[PDB]
Every structure is written in C-alpha cells, then in structure tokens.
C-alpha cells in the first residue's frame, strides 16, 4: 500500500477524535512507523494497539479508517471507550485478529455477522461489551473461519445461542467463551473436533450437561456457575485430553463419579452438593494433577493416604464439608510441591504434628481454621529456614499455650489469625521482626499482658484485632509508626490511658473500636484528622471533658477504599439487657464459623439471639466521604453536642447515651439523612426536640430518655412511630407518643 495511503488512513482516524491529544505523534508528512501504537515490518504498518485510551468514538470510525487499512494484520483496541455498534464495511483480507473487549458496543449479536467480511479473521474478541440477543434464534453468527472466539461479559440473554454462534460451522474453532452472559438451553460442540477451550461459565443453563461429541481435542472445560444437575461424567468420559475441568457452582449431587484422569492438572468440583468420601480412584491423577478443590461440599471423612503420590499437587482446598481425623500428615509431607493448603470448616481433630515444620519451607498458606484442632501451637514451626510460608490461619480451633515466638522465623508472613482459640501468656514481641506482616488477629482468646511496643518496627501493619482478650496497660506509642494501619480494634479488655492524640497522623485508620475498656481522657480532637475514620465505637469506658467540635472535619472529604472487600459480622444490641451496652459490635470474622459466637457469653452480656449481621466490607460511598458509625455511649463526656454533629450524611447510627452531655440538640441532626439510629438517652440535654429532625425519614430506632428535655415533639417525621418509653423521664415533654401538650 502507498505510503500516502497509509498517513491518510491514520490521520483521518485522529482527526474524528474528540481529543486529539490522545495520539500526539500522529502527524502528517511522518512515516506511521514511528507512531506509539504502531508495528510495522519492512516499513509497512502491520498492526495498531491503542488500548486502554479513552479514545472516545464510535465503531464506523474504526472500520473506515483503521480496519480498511490495506496490510493490517491485526489491531487492538481494548478498552479503547470504543461505543456505537458494528455494520458492514470494507475489511481488509490481511486482517487475522481484532480485539474489541472492555468497549460500549452494542446491538444484537447479530451484528457481528458483517465481520465475515474480513476473509481471514481468525480471532474475535469483543468481550466486556453490551451486545444483546434479539430474543429468538434468528439464523446464525456465519463466522466459520475464526478459530478464537471470546463474546463473555455481554448481555446476551437467550436460549440455543450457542447452537446459533456455530450453526453454520466450527470446524476452525479451537477457543470458545461466552462466560458472564445468561445464556441456556443446550450445548453442542460436537461438530468443533478441533475446540481445544470452552468456557460457558456464570451462564444461565440448568438443563442438558453440554454434549462434546468425541471430545478428542477438548483440553479445557469450565461450565461452573449455573445451575447444572446431570451426570456429567458420561458426557466427558471419551475427553482424552483434558487437562482442566471446572464445574464448581453447580446443582451437583451425589458422589464423585469416575472422570478422565490421564491428563487432568486441574480439577474443581467446589460449591455443589457432593456428598460421600474421597475416592480411591482419583490415585490415578496424582501423575499430572496441580489444583485440586473439593470444598464447599458435603464430602466427610479423612484426607485419603493415596495423596502422597500426587507429588505435583500445588493447592489442596478442601475446606467447608465435613472432615475428621487428625492432621494426616504422614501423607502431606510427600507433596513436595504443595504450595496452597486449605482445610478449614471440617472437624479435623487432634494436636498438630511435629513434622509440620519440614512442609513450611514449601508452603505458602496454611488454612487450618475453623476445625476442631487441640494442643499448643508447634513451638519449632518455621524452623526450617527459608520459610516461605505467607498466611497461617488457625483461629477458630482449640489450641491452648503460649503464642509461640518462633513465628516470627517465618520472615514471609502476611497475615496471622490465632483469633478464636484459648492461649494465654502475652503477645510475642518477636512479631515486630515479621517486617511484611499486614494482618495479626487475635481476638477471643486469652492473652494477657500489654500491647508490644515492637510493633513499631512493623511497617506493614494494616490490621490489629486484639479484642476479647485480658490486655492491660496503655496502647503502645510505637503504633505511630504503622502508618497503613486502617483497622485497629481493642474492646472488651482492661486497656487504659488516653487516646493518644498521635492517632490523627493514621490518614488509613478508618475502624477504631476501644469499648469495654478502661480509658480515659478528654476525647482527642486529632481523630478530626484522620481522613479514613468511618467507624469509632468508644462505649462504656471513662473519657471525660466536652467533645471535640473539631473531630468531624473531614466530613465529606474521606475517601475509604483500602477497607473494602474484608469479612466481618456486627451484632446489634438489643434493648433487653441493661448489662449489653453500645449500638452493636463490629468485628472482624474472616474464617470463623457464626455458630462458635456463642464463645462470647462468658465475655458479653449481650444476648446474642439471631442477632448478627455479617457478609463482605462494603462501604457506600467511594469518594463522598462522611462517617457512618459513632457511638461514644456510656461514658462521663459533657458540655454541648457541637452543631458539627450534623454534618455526617452518611452517618448510619449514633449513640450518645449515658453521659453528661447537656444543651439543647442541635437543629442540624435533622441533616442526617441517612440516619437509622439515633441515641442521646441518659444525659442533661435540654430544651426542644429541633422541628428539623422531622427530615429524618431513615430512623429505625430513636432514644431521648432520660434528659431535661422540654416541649413538643415534632407532630411530622417519625416520632409517632416509635412508643412512648423512648421519651420518658422528661417531664416538659408532650405530644403523641407523649399525651397532647394541656
Ligand atoms: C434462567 O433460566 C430459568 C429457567 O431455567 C428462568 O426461570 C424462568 O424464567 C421464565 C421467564 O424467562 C419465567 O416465566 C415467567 O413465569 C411466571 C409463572 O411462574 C409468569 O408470571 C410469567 O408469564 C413468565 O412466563 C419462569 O417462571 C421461570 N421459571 C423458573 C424460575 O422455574 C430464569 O428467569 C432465567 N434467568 C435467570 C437470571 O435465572
Ligand atoms: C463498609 C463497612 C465498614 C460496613 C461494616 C458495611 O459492610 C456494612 O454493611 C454496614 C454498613 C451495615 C451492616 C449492618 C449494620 C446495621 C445492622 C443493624 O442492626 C441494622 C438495624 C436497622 O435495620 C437499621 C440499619 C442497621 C443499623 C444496619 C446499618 C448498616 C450496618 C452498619
Ligand atoms: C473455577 O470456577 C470458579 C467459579 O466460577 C472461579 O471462581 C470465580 O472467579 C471469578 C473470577 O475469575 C470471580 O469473579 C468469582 O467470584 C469466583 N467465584 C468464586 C465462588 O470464588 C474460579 O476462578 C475458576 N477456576 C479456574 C481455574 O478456572
Ligand atoms: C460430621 O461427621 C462427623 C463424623 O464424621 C459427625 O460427628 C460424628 O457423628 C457420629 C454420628 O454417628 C458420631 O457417632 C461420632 O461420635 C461423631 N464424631 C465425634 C468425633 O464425636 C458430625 O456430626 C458431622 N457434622 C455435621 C455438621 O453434620
Ligand atoms: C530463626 O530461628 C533461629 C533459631 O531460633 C534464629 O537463630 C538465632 O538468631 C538470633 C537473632 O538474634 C541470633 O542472635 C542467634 O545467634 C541465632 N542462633 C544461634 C544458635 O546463634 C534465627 O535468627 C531466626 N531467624 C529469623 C527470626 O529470621
Ligand atoms: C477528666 O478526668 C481527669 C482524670 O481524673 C481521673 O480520671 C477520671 C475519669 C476520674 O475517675 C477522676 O476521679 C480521676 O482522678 C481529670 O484530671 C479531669 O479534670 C477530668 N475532667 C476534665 C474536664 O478534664
Ligand atoms: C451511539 C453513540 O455514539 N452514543 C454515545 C454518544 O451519544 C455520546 O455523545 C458519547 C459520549 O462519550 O458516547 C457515545
Ligand atoms: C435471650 O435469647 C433467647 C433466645 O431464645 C430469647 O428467647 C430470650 O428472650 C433472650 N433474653 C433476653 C433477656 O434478651
């Protein structure tokens, strides 16, 4: 192709851009070989990528300019802010592969038709896109020269699409996907004798296991995520080759049936219904298999012994069905390369082997929680040097002893949670040596002593949950220093002190939980300085003096993001027992079972009834920025609730109660839009109920016992809803719920 047909092709593509600035040295009278996103070979421009441009246009800019191209063999445009919808143009025959994924093209998939224009595409990726189905089966894509096919994360919602993507031929097809749609009906690629991939996962089909005819060629196979309940090992039972096998989140029932095991490196039957024990035959796999995961199954029983054998073994999930015995260890330390170990949530019993040790120089996680183990935890872990080993998780179990200070040999660790266990002693000091450590949890236990102030040394730090546990003395100065610390939490123990007011320098602290304890001190107005704090709970403890006007500054300027994504479970207080204090509890409860809760009884008044709350962080706003949750009840605090106080929206709960907090309620609390609980009982407010709370259309539970109050209560809003004792013990008060102001 000329030289001038080439610059013009380019420019012309540059020149419909809104922001021309996006390709800046495109230029005339300058070979495109030397344009960023350019390749070319032998001076001659061969393919385009300008991926993950917001290049801003409609698809017909592309197919005239840049698919016209005479010569391009290939381009790439990912994430290009690529929108409008494909039609019929002039494609060039060199063209092979053309990748359209992550864009706003929309339409039928019907319109992928007119790509057959391109005589020799082979590679189709238009992925991550909004195309739709026109609802009924209507002919066929007709593109029966491609041999790689992506078209998942549309919105394709249809039945027998995929018998309409390959009616009129596969016989090229060697990778099919069509994951993350709502695709059913039947799948047939029995005619693809050459399909090699095929990934119909997090579809919508609940009928037929697919039919793969010979299934001569079939190396990977992922049909997790829908609804299937059949027998899919008659359909796979002539797969020779097939080298990964994903059907987990799935209807399947019943026992493993027999599978292709000659070439299997990969196998998921996670997330069904499996019942039984772990077959004798799967032995057969040990000679290829890399990833196994079983869990989320009704599976009981012991690690079977064959497992010794599987020397290639990388990752073993085996958690969340039903698994007894004893660490059957005289088999794990034959998998020389197991990396992943993944036990939780059965009912492995027993103390932990001595020769745990030898496998931590090869592993990289150690999932033991949420089982029935015993005994102290093995002083010599991590004994072998070169510990690699980065997670260990063992709360939730039945240890006793001493926290080892070998754990700090592990020079690799990230995360440690002991939570849920009954060790006593103190916090090793050695912990400040694990440099990368992000995450020590060890909460419901019995660890006495004071908070090592060698966690200074811990630049990673990023959670600290220590509460339920008989800690004493001051918080560490140290901690100033763990500046990604964003989730610090420390109730229900004999702590003391003050808040330092170094607390503000934790631009990241975004829970901190102090309640239960023995504190003390005016409330630091630094915390007005942290610029991820969603989340203070401070009941029952003794700080004293006003309250800061200055800690809500960040108001509508926090960003909290590090937080999301992190297992938890709150438990609402009930008005029940008087003993149970505070709005409710946030605590951390990733890999711990709910129903061990009842461990707190003998720690917690609070009745704990059907009352938790749980599921994954997920914070509402993601720049907005206000506090969600503040409760300061049950201490000595006085003075006047700042007008500041309503500059919260997001704010969900508030607990002011049993305090000495006096004046009249600010009118801005009505501001609080978001509001579901509102306390401020047991105090020497005065006064009226501000008219403007009235605006307040979310609150679900509201107290203003027990004050000086005086007045009416607002006849609009919510006030009639709630009953009467929510208002008592202020005698200048009327007005339904309270009889009518005489
Ligand atoms: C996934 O596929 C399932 C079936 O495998 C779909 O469920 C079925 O969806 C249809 C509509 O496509 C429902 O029809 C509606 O049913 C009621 C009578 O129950 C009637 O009010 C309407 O006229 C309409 O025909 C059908 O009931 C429903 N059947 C079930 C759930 O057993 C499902 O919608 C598909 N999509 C998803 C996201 O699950
Ligand atoms: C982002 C992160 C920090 C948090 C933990 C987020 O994941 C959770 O969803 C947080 C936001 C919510 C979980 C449950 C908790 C309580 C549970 C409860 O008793 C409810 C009673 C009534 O129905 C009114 C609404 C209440 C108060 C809600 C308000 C929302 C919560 C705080
Ligand atoms: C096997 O399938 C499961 C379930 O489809 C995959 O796990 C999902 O992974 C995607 C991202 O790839 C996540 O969005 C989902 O949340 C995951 N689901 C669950 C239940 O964890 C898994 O990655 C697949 N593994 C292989 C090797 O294909
Ligand atoms: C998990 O299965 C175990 C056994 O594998 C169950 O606990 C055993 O239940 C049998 C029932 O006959 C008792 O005879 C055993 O004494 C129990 N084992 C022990 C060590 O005490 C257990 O109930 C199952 N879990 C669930 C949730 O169903
Ligand atoms: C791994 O554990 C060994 C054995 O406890 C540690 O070896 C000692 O390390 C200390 C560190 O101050 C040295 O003073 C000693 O001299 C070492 N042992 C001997 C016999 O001299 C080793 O430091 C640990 N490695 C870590 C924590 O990374
Ligand atoms: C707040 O408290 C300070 C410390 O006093 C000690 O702790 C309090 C909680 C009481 O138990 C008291 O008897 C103890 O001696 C006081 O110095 C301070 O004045 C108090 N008030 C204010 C407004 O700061
Ligand atoms: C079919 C089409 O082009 N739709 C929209 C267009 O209306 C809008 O101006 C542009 C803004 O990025 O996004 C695209
Ligand atoms: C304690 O919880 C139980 C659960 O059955 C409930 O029936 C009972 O009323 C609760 N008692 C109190 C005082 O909250």
Same mark, same amino acid.
């Given at each position: 192709?000329?030289?001038?047909?080439?610059?013009?092709?380019?420019?012309?593509?540059?020149?419909?851009?809104?922001?021309?600035?996006?390709?800046?040295?495109?230029?005339?009278?300058?070979?495109?070989?030397?344009?960023?996103? #350019?390749?070319?070979?032998?001076?001659?421009?061969?393919?385009?990528?300008?991926?993950?441009?917001?290049?801003?246009?409609?698809?017909?800019?592309?197919?005239?300019?840049?698919?016209?191209?005479?010569?391009?063999?290939?381009?790439?445009?990912?994430?290009?802010?690529?929108?409008?919808?494909?039609?019929?143009?002039?494609?060039?025959?060199?063209?092979?592969?053309?990748?359209?994924?992550?864009?706003?093209?929309?339409?039928? #998939?019907?319109?992928?038709?007119?790509?057959?224009?391109?005589?020799?595409?082979?590679?189709?990726?238009?992925?991550?896109?909004?195309?739709?189905?026109?609802?009924?089966?209507?002919?066929?894509?007709?593109?029966?020269?491609?041999?790689?096919?992506?078209?998942?994360?549309?919105?394709?919602?249809?039945?027998?699409?995929?018998?309409? #993507?390959?009616?009129?031929?596969?016989?090229?097809?060697?990778?099919?996907?069509?994951?993350?749609?709502?695709?059913?009906?039947?799948?047939?690629?029995?005619?693809?004798?050459?399909?090699?991939?095929?990934?119909?996962?997090?579809?919508?089909?609940?009928?037929?296991?697919?039919?793969?005819?010979?299934?001569?060629?079939?190396?990977?196979?992922?049909? !997790?995520?829908?609804?299937?309940?059949?027998?899919?090992?008659?359909?796979?039972?002539?797969?020779?080759?097939?080298?990964?096998?994903?059907?987990?989140?799935?209807?399947?029932?019943?026992?493993?049936?027999?599978?292709?095991?000659?070439?299997?490196?990969?196998?998921?039957?996670?997330?069904?219904?499996?019942?039984?024990?772990?077959?004798?035959?799967?032995?057969?796999?040990?000679?290829?298999?890399?990833?196994?995961?079983?869990?989320?199954?009704?599976?009981?029983?012991?690690?079977?012994?064959?497992?010794? !054998?599987? !020397?290639?073994?990388?990752?073993?999930?085996?958690?969340?069905?039903?698994?007894?015995?004893?660490?059957?260890?005289?088999?794990?330390?034959?998998?020389?390369?197991?990396?992943?170990?993944?036990?939780?949530?059965?009912?492995?019993?027993?103390?932990?082997?001595?020769?745990?040790?030898?496998?931590?120089?090869?592993?990289?996680?150690?999932?033991?929680?949420?089982?029935?183990?015993?005994?102290?935890?093995?002083?010599?872990?991590?004994?072998?040097?070169?510990?690699?080993?980065?997670?260990?998780?063992?709360?939730?179990?039945?240890?006793?002893?001493?926290?080892?200070?070998?754990?700090?040999?592990?020079?690799?660790?990230?995360?440690?949670?002991?939570?849920?266990?009954?060790?006593?002693?103190?916090?090793?000091?050695?912990?400040?040596?694990?440099?990368?450590?992000?995450?020590?949890?060890?909460?419901?236990?019995?660890?006495?002593?004071?908070?090592?102030?060698?966690?200074?040394?811990?630049?990673?730090?990023?959670?600290?949950?220590?509460?339920?546990?008989?800690?004493?003395?001051?918080?560490?100065?140290?901690?100033?220093?763990? @500046?990604?610390?964003?989730?610090?939490?420390?109730?229900?123990?004999?702590?003391?002190?003050?808040?330092?007011?170094?607390?503000?320098?934790?631009?990241?602290?975004?829970?901190?939980?102090?309640?239960?304890?023995?504190?003390?001190?005016?409330?630091?107005?630094?915390?007005?300085?942290?610029?991820?704090?969603?989340?203070?709970?401070?009941?029952?403890?003794?700080?004293?003096?006003?309250?800061?006007?200055?800690?809500?500054?960040?108001?509508?300027?926090?960003?909290?993001?590090?937080?999301?994504?992190?297992?938890?479970?709150?438990?609402?207080?009930?008005?029940?027992?008087?003993?149970?204090?505070?709005?409710?509890?946030?605590?951390?409860?990733?890999?711990?079972?709910?129903?061990?809760?009842?461990?707190?009884?003998?720690?917690?008044?609070?009745?704990?009834?059907?009352?938790?709350?749980?599921?994954?962080?997920?914070? @509402?706003?993601?720049?907005?920025?206000?506090?969600?949750?503040?409760?300061?009840?049950?201490?000595?605090?006085?003075?006047?609730?700042?007008?500041?106080?309503? !500059?919260?929206?997001?704010?969900?709960?508030?607990?002011?109660?049993?305090?000495?907090?006096?004046?009249?309620?600010?009118?801005?609390?009505?501001?609080?839009?978001?509001?579901?609980?509102?306390?401020?009982?047991?105090?020497?407010?005065?006064?009226?109920?501000?008219?403007?709370?009235?605006?307040?259309?979310?609150?679900?539970?509201?107290?203003?016992?027990?004050?000086?109050?005086?007045?009416?209560?607002?006849?609009?809003?919510?006030?009639?809803?709630?009953?009467?004792?929510?208002?008592?013990?202020?005698?200048?008060?009327?007005?339904?719920?309270?009889?009518?102001?005489?």
């Amino acid at each position: 192709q000329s030289l001038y047909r080439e610059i013009h092709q380019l420019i012309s593509f540059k020149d419909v851009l809104p922001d021309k600035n996006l390709l800046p040295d495109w230029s005339s009278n300058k070979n495109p070989c030397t344009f960023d996103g #350019v390749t070319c070979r032998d001076d001659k421009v061969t393919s385009i990528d300008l991926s993950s441009k917001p290049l801003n246009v409609g698809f017909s800019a592309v197919s005239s300019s840049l698919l016209s191209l005479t010569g391009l063999e290939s381009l790439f445009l990912s994430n290009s802010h690529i929108n409008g919808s494909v039609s019929g143009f002039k494609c060039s025959a060199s063209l092979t592969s053309l990748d359209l994924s992550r864009n706003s093209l929309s339409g039928p #998939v019907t319109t992928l038709t007119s790509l057959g224009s391109c005589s020799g595409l082979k590679f189709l990726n238009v992925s991550s896109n909004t195309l739709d189905f026109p609802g009924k089966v209507s002919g066929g894509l007709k593109l029966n020269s491609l041999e790689v096919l992506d078209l998942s994360a549309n919105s394709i919602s249809g039945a027998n699409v995929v018998g309409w #993507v390959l009616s009129d031929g596969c016989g090229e097809l060697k990778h099919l996907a069509i994951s993350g749609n709502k695709i059913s009906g039947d799948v047939d690629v029995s005619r693809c004798v050459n399909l090699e991939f095929l990934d119909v996962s997090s579809n919508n089909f609940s009928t037929g296991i697919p039919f793969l005819g010979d299934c001569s060629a079939l190396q990977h196979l992922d049909i !997790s995520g829908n609804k299937l309940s059949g027998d899919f090992s008659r359909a796979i039972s002539t797969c020779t080759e097939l080298k990964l096998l994903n059907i987990s989140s799935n209807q399947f029932v019943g026992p493993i049936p027999p599978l292709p095991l000659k070439s299997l490196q990969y196998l998921s039957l996670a997330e069904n219904k499996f019942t039984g024990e772990i077959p004798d035959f799967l032995s057969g796999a040990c000679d290829t298999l890399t990833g196994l995961d079983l869990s989320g199954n009704h599976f009981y029983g012991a690690v079977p012994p064959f497992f010794g !054998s599987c !020397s290639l073994l990388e990752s073993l999930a085996l958690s969340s069905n039903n698994f007894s015995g004893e660490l059957p260890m005289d088999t794990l330390l034959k998998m020389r390369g197991l990396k992943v170990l993944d036990l939780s949530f059965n009912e492995f019993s027993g103390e932990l082997p001595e020769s745990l040790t030898n496998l931590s120089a090869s592993l990289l996680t150690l999932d033991l929680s949420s089982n029935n183990f015993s005994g102290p935890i093995l002083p010599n872990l991590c004994q072998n040097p070169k510990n690699t080993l980065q997670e260990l998780y063992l709360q939730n179990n039945g240890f006793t002893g001493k926290i080892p200070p070998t754990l700090s040999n592990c020079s690799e660790l990230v995360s440690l949670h002991l939570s849920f266990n009954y060790l006593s002693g103190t916090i090793p000091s050695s912990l400040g040596s694990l440099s990368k450590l992000r995450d020590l949890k060890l909460w419901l236990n019995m660890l006495e002593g004071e908070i090592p102030q060698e966690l200074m040394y811990v630049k990673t730090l990023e959670t600290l949950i220590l509460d339920f546990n008989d800690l004493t003395g001051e918080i560490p100065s140290g901690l100033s220093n763990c @500046t990604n610390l964003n989730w610090i939490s420390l109730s229900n123990n004999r702590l003391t002190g003050e808040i330092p007011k170094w607390i503000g320098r934790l631009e990241n602290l975004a829970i901190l939980k102090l309640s239960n304890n023995s504190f003390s001190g005016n409330i630091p107005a630094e915390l007005g300085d942290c610029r991820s704090l969603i989340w203070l709970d401070l009941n029952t403890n003794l700080f004293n003096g006003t309250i800061p006007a200055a800690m809500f500054k960040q108001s509508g300027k926090i960003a909290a993001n590090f937080i999301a994504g992190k297992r938890y479970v709150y438990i609402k207080n009930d008005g029940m027992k008087k003993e149970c204090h505070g709005a409710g509890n946030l605590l951390e409860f990733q890999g711990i079972r709910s129903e061990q809760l009842n461990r707190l009884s003998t720690r917690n008044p609070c009745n704990i009834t059907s009352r938790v709350y749980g599921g994954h962080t997920s914070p @509402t706003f993601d720049n907005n920025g206000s506090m969600m949750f503040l409760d300061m009840s049950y201490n000595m605090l006085s003075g006047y609730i700042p007008k500041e106080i309503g !500059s919260m929206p997001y704010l969900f709960i508030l607990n002011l109660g049993h305090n000495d907090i006096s004046g009249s309620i600010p009118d801005e609390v009505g501001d609080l839009r978001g509001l579901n609980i509102l306390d401020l009982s047991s105090n020497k407010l005065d006064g009226r109920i501000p008219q403007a709370m009235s605006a307040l259309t979310m609150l679900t539970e509201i107290d203003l016992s027990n004050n000086n109050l005086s007045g009416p209560i607002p006849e609009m809003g919510q006030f009639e809803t709630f009953p009467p004792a929510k208002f008592l013990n202020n005698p200048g008060l009327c007005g339904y719920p309270l009889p009518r102001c005489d």
